[PDB]
Amino acid sequence: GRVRTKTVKRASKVLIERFYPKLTLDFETNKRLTSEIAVIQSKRLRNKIAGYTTHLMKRIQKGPVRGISFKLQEEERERKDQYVPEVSALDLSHTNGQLEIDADTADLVKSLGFKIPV
Amino acid sequence: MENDKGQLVELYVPRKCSATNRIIKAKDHASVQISIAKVDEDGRAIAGENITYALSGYVRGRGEADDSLNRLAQQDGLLKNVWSYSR
Amino acid sequence: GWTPVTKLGRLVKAGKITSVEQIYLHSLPVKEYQIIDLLLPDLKDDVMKIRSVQKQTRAGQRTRMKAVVVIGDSNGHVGLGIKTAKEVASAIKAAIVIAKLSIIPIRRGYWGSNLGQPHSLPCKVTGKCGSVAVRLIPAPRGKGIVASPVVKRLMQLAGVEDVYTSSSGSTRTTENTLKAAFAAIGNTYSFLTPNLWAETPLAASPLEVYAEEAAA
Amino acid sequence: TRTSVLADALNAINNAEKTGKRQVLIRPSSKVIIKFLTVMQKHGYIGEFEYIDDHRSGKIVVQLNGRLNKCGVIQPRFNVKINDIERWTDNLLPARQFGYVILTTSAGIMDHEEARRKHVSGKILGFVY
Amino acid sequence: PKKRASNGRNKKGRGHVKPVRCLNCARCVPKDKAIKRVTIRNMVEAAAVRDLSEASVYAEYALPKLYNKLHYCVSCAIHARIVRVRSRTDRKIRTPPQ
Amino acid sequence: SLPASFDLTPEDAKLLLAANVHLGAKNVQVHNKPYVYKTRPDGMNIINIGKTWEKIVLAARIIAAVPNASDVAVCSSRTFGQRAVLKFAAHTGATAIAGRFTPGNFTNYITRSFKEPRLVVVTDPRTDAQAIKESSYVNIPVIALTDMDSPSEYVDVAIPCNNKGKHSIGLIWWLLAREVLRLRGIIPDRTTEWSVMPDLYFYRDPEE
Amino acid sequence: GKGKPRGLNSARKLRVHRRNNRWADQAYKARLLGTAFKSSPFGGSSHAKGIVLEKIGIESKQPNSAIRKCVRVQLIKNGKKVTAFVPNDGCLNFVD
Amino acid sequence: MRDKWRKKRVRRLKRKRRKVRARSK
RNA sequence: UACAACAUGUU
RNA sequence: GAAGAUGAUCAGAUACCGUCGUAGUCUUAACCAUAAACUAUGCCGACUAGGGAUCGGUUGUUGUUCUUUUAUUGACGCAAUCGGCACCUUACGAGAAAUCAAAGUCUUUGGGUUCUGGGGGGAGUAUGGUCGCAAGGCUGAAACUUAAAGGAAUUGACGGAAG
Numbered sequence A: 001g002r003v004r005t006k007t008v009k010r011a012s013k014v015l016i017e018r019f020y021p022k023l024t025l026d027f028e029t030n031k032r033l034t035s036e037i038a039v040i041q042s043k044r045l046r047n048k049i050a051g052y053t054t055h056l057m058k059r060i061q062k063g064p065v066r067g068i069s070f071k072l073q074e075e076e077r078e079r080k081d082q083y084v085p086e087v088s089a090l091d092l093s094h095t096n097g098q099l100e101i102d103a104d105t106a107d108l109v110k111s112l113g114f115k116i117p118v
Numbered sequence B: 001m002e003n004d005k006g007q008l009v010e011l012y013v014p015r016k017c018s019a020t021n022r023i024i025k026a027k028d029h030a031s032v033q034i035s036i037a038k039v040d041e042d043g044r045a046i047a048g049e050n051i052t053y054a055l056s057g058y059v060r061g062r063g064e065a066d067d068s069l070n071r072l073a074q075q076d077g078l079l080k081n082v083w084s085y086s087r
Numbered sequence C: 001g002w003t004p005v006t007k008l009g010r011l012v013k014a015g016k017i018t019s020v021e022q023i024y025l026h027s028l029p030v031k032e033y034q035i036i037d038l039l040l041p042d043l044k045d046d047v048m049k050i051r052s053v054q055k056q057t058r059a060g061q062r063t064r065m066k067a068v069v070v071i072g073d074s075n076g077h078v079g080l081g082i083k084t085a086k087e088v089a090s091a092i093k094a095a096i097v098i099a100k101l102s103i104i105p106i107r108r109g110y111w112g113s114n115l116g117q118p119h120s121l122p123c124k125v126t127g128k129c130g131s132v133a134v135r136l137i138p139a140p141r142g143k144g145i146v147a148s149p150v151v152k153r154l155m156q157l158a159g160v161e162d163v164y165t166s167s168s169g170s171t172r173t174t175e176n177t178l179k180a181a182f183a184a185i186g187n188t189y190s191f192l193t194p195n196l197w198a199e200t201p202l203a204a205s206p207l208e209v210y211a212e213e214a215a216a
Numbered sequence D: 001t002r003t004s005v006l007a008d009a010l011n012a013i014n015n016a017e018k019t020g021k022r023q024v025l026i027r028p029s030s031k032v033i034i035k036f037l038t039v040m041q042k043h044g045y046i047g048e049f050e051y052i053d054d055h056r057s058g059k060i061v062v063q064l065n066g067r068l069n070k071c072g073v074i075q076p077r078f079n080v081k082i083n084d085i086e087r088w089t090d091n092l093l094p095a096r097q098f099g100y101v102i103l104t105t106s107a108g109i110m111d112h113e114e115a116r117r118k119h120v121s122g123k124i125l126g127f128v129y
Numbered sequence E: 001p002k003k004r005a006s007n008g009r010n011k012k013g014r015g016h017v018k019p020v021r022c023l024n025c026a027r028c029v030p031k032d033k034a035i036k037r038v039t040i041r042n043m044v045e046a047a048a049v050r051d052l053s054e055a056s057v058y059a060e061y062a063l064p065k066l067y068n069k070l071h072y073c074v075s076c077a078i079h080a081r082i083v084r085v086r087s088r089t090d091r092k093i094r095t096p097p098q
Numbered sequence F: 001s002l003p004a005s006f007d008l009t010p011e012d013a014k015l016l017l018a019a020n021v022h023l024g025a026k027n028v029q030v031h032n033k034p035y036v037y038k039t040r041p042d043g044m045n046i047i048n049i050g051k052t053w054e055k056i057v058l059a060a061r062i063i064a065a066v067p068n069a070s071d072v073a074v075c076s077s078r079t080f081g082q083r084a085v086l087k088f089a090a091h092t093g094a095t096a097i098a099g100r101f102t103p104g105n106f107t108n109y110i111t112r113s114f115k116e117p118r119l120v121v122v123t124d125p126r127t128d129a130q131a132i133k134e135s136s137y138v139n140i141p142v143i144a145l146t147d148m149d150s151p152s153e154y155v156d157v158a159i160p161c162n163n164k165g166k167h168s169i170g171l172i173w174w175l176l177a178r179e180v181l182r183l184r185g186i187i188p189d190r191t192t193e194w195s196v197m198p199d200l201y202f203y204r205d206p207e208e
Numbered sequence G: 001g002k003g004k005p006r007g008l009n010s011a012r013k014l015r016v017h018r019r020n021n022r023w024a025d026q027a028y029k030a031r032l033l034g035t036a037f038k039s040s041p042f043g044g045s046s047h048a049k050g051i052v053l054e055k056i057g058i059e060s061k062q063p064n065s066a067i068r069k070c071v072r073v074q075l076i077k078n079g080k081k082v083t084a085f086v087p088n089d090g091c092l093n094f095v096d
Numbered sequence H: 001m002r003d004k005w006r007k008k009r010v011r012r013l014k015r016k017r018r019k020v021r022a023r024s025k
Numbered sequence I: 001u002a003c004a005a006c007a008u009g010u011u
Numbered sequence J: 001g002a003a004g005a006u007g008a009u010c011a012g013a014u015a016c017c018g019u020c021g022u023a024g025u026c027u028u029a030a031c032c033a034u035a036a037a038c039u040a041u042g043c044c045g046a047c048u049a050g051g052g053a054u055c056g057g058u059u060g061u062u063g064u065u066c067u068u069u070u071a072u073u074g075a076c077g078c079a080a081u082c083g084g085c086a087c088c089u090u091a092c093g094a095g096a097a098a099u100c101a102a103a104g105u106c107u108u109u110g111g112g113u114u115c116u117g118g119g120g121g122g123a124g125u126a127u128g129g130u131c132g133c134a135a136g137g138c139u140g141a142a143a144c145u146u147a148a149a150g151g152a153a154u155u156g157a158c159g160g161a162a163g
């Protein structure tokens, strides 16, 4: 079969990490770009790297893939990681007016010297 | 370790476990040394001032370090009504 | 051209930590032999046994050489290292490294009166490894080291002058014998005597009071 | 059945000591156990120990301070001359400067150094160090 | 050495157990040790289910179920793949497969 | 000692009780006896809350007593504490370990991932066994968030809290961070609130 | 424990038990049975004299191959017949 | 030799040795 | 279904 | 179904496999006293770490099923204990290791007590005694011979072993 070795795969990973905006979804344009980027000493190795990179790009379009870390994904994964809801979930507004706790915790908190409404 | 004319010849006096009074050895790499910041009355810590608790590997491996530190801390004033002597 | 890769090594090279007892007191793991040979410059090694071990393969045996080394400053510090390598010289060098990284302090003591410096052990201690058990017993002044040659060399490089020995088991297994003796001689700093009852306050490790020169 | 209550007491003390326990319950108690415990306490190896009356034989709770390596009985209680104490201290004791061989003598239960001071001897009872 | 803590059987608490005869070779084997299987199978093979349904007089008539319990000696159980030799850390699994 | 200013303020009881922290595991250990308040018809045990609170305070003082803040290590293998530990590291300057703990990060000194923390703070003692096991080799104290069925071997300080629940884990980490900030001096006082809203620290689903 | 009595009045049991089990040691058993006096060819002596009856060659056992020169000897004190090795190169020609 | 049959061989041998003995009291 | 055995001694 | 007779397989099979089939298998009254009669782990006593089940007894208790829908019903469910047959995790501690909650509390060597072993063979043989109808059981040497025999684990190789 045609299973891609580790050299081509790691080469493609570093191309995607370090030049993501330049790379495209076209094998020929990817060829001419990988000629400029890396210094492979063989036409065949250059072609295998570029084509497997094109396949990787065509996969990346349908969501992030685990293993690649170009400096474009972190921006979304970070500004989406600051998601601060305007309405909180730990406030007692969502649960109408009473801590929906069973009687056991009711007696527990009454033992802690609180006057809590439940 | 003394001699006739009172000069100490001990190479070094080793630390002992605060919970079990056992000597902590030089290769006892499972032993720890807790350091807890002491707090001023504002509610802030204090620059370079602590009380430190030494535990040996034996108590830590026996799963007894938590109760031992509970006792030591609450008896030094760093805790209240957590550790109970009656069970 | 050595450059430290650990906080303790960084502190040792900077001169913040000047003694091994500064390390033993807090049980700091030592991974760089440069720490030892800076802190403990004058050290004597001694190859104790060279043995060939073999692995059977489909083409033939695979002979490797196992070396046993004892290191010691004759002043209360001693270490034991074992390493197996394809050549005798490389095995001995790596065993010297391993021996330096395992050096421990030894508690010397008096058998009877306390004229002068400690000459023997403080108490009876024993160590075991495999079938071998080695028992070290305090001896009066003027006794030599009553021991087999391997244990005697270990006691001399530890710095002990008076000691009785009594082994049991297959003492011809030299690695087990030396490991049992090493475990025995290190237990002098674990047997609690009344003179160590007096509580001393828990001090602060140098890696605490120098926690910026240790970061890098 | 039970053949030496002192042996059970000292074994329980040693086993509780090795596990890091601060306290050990001894049952049953006896005069010999109390005298032996008093000898061990006077040297600091144990703390306060308290006797519970159950109208049957008594129980003892001992406060262990963690300073004790080994307590045990020498059974049978061998007869010891005045100058055969040397071999017993050489064989049972860690060193010539700490630890005690407890003897029962006609002058009472004591350790071997007190026996030398009083020049008395009797039967060996146990040891502590 | 000792291979198994149960000695390859189930007899902690008693002296002796009556034997049973192996299904294949009629070997006497202790009941607690015999490998035993409870099999429920359909009395008619599946490829003839609809043919017998067509040929039957009755309508909505159930199919009788075959019940038997099978006992094997260890040799006749291993030679039939009913159990298979397992590894040292996998011998210590009594939970059935899935 | 310590003033009568911490005292488990009732708003903290709000946050704990809403986040279902006190919901202990159905089966409890002998080492977790002085943490259960009682049992309930379902079966699960209720964890005392004042104990949890002042254990959080004790832990926070342990963190605050440390020199350069990167020497505090927070970690979680479980897919509920990654966000919490990363937020804690951001707001305290400590070092976080999310996802995988590579066996050898604490003892193997030639890795380019070598770390020498002075304290290991962990989400779950069981699911994060590797970090604790390796800390035992190199003398690192461990502060742990322990449930009622979590193992206690090789832990110095245990915070009794439900470590199965998303909101519970996030809230516990958030309170640790806030205590540490108040002690360090970033937050002026207990009365002063925090720019960080509680639903932060809470791991979000990767599907919206 | 230990399977031996420890009672302070148990000296008879201890001494008799040691005496019984010393029979399991070969040297003790030989010196108390007097086997050297009764069954040894030399009767317990270090040396003995005898008359050569015949020269015999004995095949060396594996993994060696050789002929070890020996003589069959009848002892004087008791008339017993023993085989003795004649040790050195060509020393068999000295004995007849 | 399967010591079981080694014992069986001795039993038969010892049985016959007891026949030869009884032949002459 | 059937399948028995492999001269001595080493480096 | 030992033995025996007989058909096959086979180089040969007085073996495995097939067909018979005498003792025996069963019982009564007497003998015999041995098994890998094994947990290959003496008995009595004390202590040392966690967990969930199960059998017997007792003690407190329900949103359940049954008498009746109701009791002094029965079953079942939930917590405590005493005794058991065991099991699971860890390695305190043990061990040559396999492994062991005892095979732990044993060079820091001592709770009480019985029995057994002292390199491998010869040999559980010979002999004397003794018990048995007998088969045999119990007690039980020596000469002589010999450098290993053996235990647990590792790597490899091999298997008419599995994947």
Ligand SMILES: CN[C@@H]1[C@@H](O)[C@@H](O[C@@H]2[C@@H](O)[C@H](O[C@H]3O[C@H]([C@@H](C)O)[C@@H](O)[C@H](O)[C@H]3N)[C@@H](N)C[C@H]2N)OC[C@]1(C)O
Residues within 6 Å of the ligand: G016, G020, G023, J141
């Ligand atoms: C023929 N060899 C014998 C051997 O049989 C054995 O002999 C014992 C002997 O020692 C026993 O006798 C022994 O044990 C008893 C004890 C039971 O009371 C002691 O009283 C007696 O002094 C002591 N000799 C004796 N009762 C039986 C022989 N088989 O041990 C001694 C021996 C010489 O090796």
Ligand SMILES: CN[C@@H]1[C@@H](O)[C@@H](O[C@@H]2[C@@H](O)[C@H](O[C@H]3O[C@H]([C@@H](C)O)[C@@H](O)[C@H](O)[C@H]3N)[C@@H](N)C[C@H]2N)OC[C@]1(C)O
Residues within 6 Å of the ligand: H009
């Ligand atoms: C007729 N039954 C015989 C029975 O007599 C006996 O046979 C022995 C046999 O074992 C002896 O065999 C003995 O002698 C040979 C020989 C090389 O020296 C050696 O293998 C060894 O010493 C020993 N097996 C043999 N020498 C005499 C037969 N009567 O043992 C075998 C047997 C089948 O039970």
Ligand SMILES: [Zn+2]
Residues within 6 Å of the ligand: E022, E023, E024, E025, E026, E027, E072, E073, E074, E075, E076, E077
């Ligand atoms: Zn079968």
